[PDB]
Symmetry: C2
Subunit: 316 residues, 2 copies
């Protein structure tokens, strides 16, 4: 009955420790050869704490080479939604259908039940599980209970991509820093990453709207209550004094995408820092006149454009 934290319409926490997410989109079960898209998906165990939705597009006998692998870390606050719920599942399904990629959409542990850095560790665990397929054939499945045939048969570990939106984009950033410090299994490398609307807190020269100065900062306090340095913690402020060098990103290619709202001023400060960092790689930028939610649906022109832009990046 008793409420300790209230964020309508997204999340409520009760005194008894119950968490309610009334806005969250519905669960969508596994499906073989979706009528609309031809895509198939399956929910696989990675650890006792981590799982993922794997996606396989419809493949023609003529299309003889393994596909790029797209590993996705969903957004929504560090505290909402699921790889298995309609919002992110439908988007990933469309990116997989357009790109012709093996998808891996990570079900990481949410705050506040599991504060950061749980999400970061879970997304690293999932990316290492993808990399662990290096050099395997179907005979590996006799003794490895956790390996995914769709990756063994249809996924090219020379074409490994990350993606994330909002806090998921923040997770991509933190995973790329870790990938520069710690090699993935078998020397697998991340070829590229797509950060859409990444969740960063950087001090703009001019005060922004109350939404940016209050609400937008509040997600970090909910996600990581004990964060050393608060909103200047390097995991949320990538240009903090003590922050890891952006030159250390463990990938060669980046697509960073923004829409025409106040977050664009923070993303521009991130891009300025990345460009000055001496990161050795190709940076591409999407800069759209649109609302954030529009880009997830191909039912919108800008969504069709964005999903095609993602496909063109992964397939370059």
């Amino acid at each position: 009955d008793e409420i300790v934290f209230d964020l309508h319409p997204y999340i409520r926490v009760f005194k008894n420790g119950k968490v309610e997410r009334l806005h969250d989109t519905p669960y969508v079960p596994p499906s073989l050869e979706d009528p609309a898209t031809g895509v198939s998906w399956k929910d696989v165990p990675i650890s006792s704490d981590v799982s993922a939705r794997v996606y396989l597009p419809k493949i023609s006998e003529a299309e003889k080479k393994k596909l790029p692998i797209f590993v996705y870390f969903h957004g929504a606050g560090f505290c909402l939604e699921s790889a298995f719920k309609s919002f992110f599942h439908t988007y990933v399904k469309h990116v997989v259908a357009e790109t012709k990629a093996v998808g891996v959409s990570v079900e990481y542990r949410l705050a506040p039940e599991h504060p950061l850095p749980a999400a970061y560790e879970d997304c690293w665990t999932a990316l290492q599980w993808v990399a662990s397929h290096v050099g395997l054939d179907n005979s590996s499945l006799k003794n490895a209970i956790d390996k995914e045939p769709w990756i063994i048969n249809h996924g090219d570990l020379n074409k490994l991509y990350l993606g994330g939106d909002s806090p998921g984009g923040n997770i991509v950033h933190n995973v790329l820093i870790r990938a520069g410090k710690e090699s993935l299994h078998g020397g697998v490398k991340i070829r590229g990453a797509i950060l859409y609307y990444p969740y960063f807190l950087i001090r703009t020269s001019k005060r922004q709207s109350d939404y940016m100065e209050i609400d937008y900062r509040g997600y970090w306090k909910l996600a990581y209550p004990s964060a050393p340095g608060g909103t200047d913690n390097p995991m949320i402020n990538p240009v903090a004094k003590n922050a890891p060098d952006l030159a250390g990103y463990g990938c060669s290619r980046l697509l960073v995408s923004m829409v025409s709202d106040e977050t664009r001023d923070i993303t521009l400060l991130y891009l300025e820092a990345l460009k000055k960092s001496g990161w050795k790689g190709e940076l591409e930028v999407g800069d759209y006149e649109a609302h954030f939610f529009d880009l997830f649906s191909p039912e919108n022109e800008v969504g069709k454009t964005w999903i095609k832009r993602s496909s063109d990046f992964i397939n370059k």
Copy 2:
């Protein structure tokens, strides 16, 4: 806002066609090597409409032969719960851990969104998908996108069992009649089936409680509104005048289990009919002094007894 069907605390249907299931237990995601039990599970696509939770127990290098396969059809009204929700998932996890079996718990379509016979067709689709593993090795996965390595490597199709509780037991009955009329792929046969508390409507000689005469019959009207003959439809009344011969069950061994409530009088009429039918097979009966829900949890003595009884049946 507007309610057309009300069954507290289980299910409410709105004028706008929305269905609310407020009592349903929580979703439990895929997990590798569950700390409590050692079991692993994974949600796999079978068709555009059907999926299943597959289970693998912890297997020792010494345990060198493929395991029995246990295909489960959950109960709860034809209208509630999921293979992926805690109630049935936890029970199947415990049966798999005790038995040392490959589990396949079918996510069939529920009423009222999908009236019967949808559940019956979906459980047949899932059993045929299990049978479709006959003779496959790991090389099959190059060109068959839907096959499950845990069945290929660890499941013995010579040791194929069904199980179901309440309406799930009704589904086992209807699937066994179909299996007598239609061979499974590759000549695979059902070795045995476990019907716990099967949902049947048979006329007792004496009127029972109002719960049995009203509420208990109501699930059939909700599940199959247009059923020819209503509660005398052969799919719910297995001794109806026009009903398929029980001798035609497509398995050799049955365990039928009852508890000490009024459903026992209907199950006894079913068992009398099965015994008189000239079905060629071994019938075992569990007859427990207990409450229906007690047998699903090994935290109860009778639950421990029942899960061990199921294991002893599958492993005979």
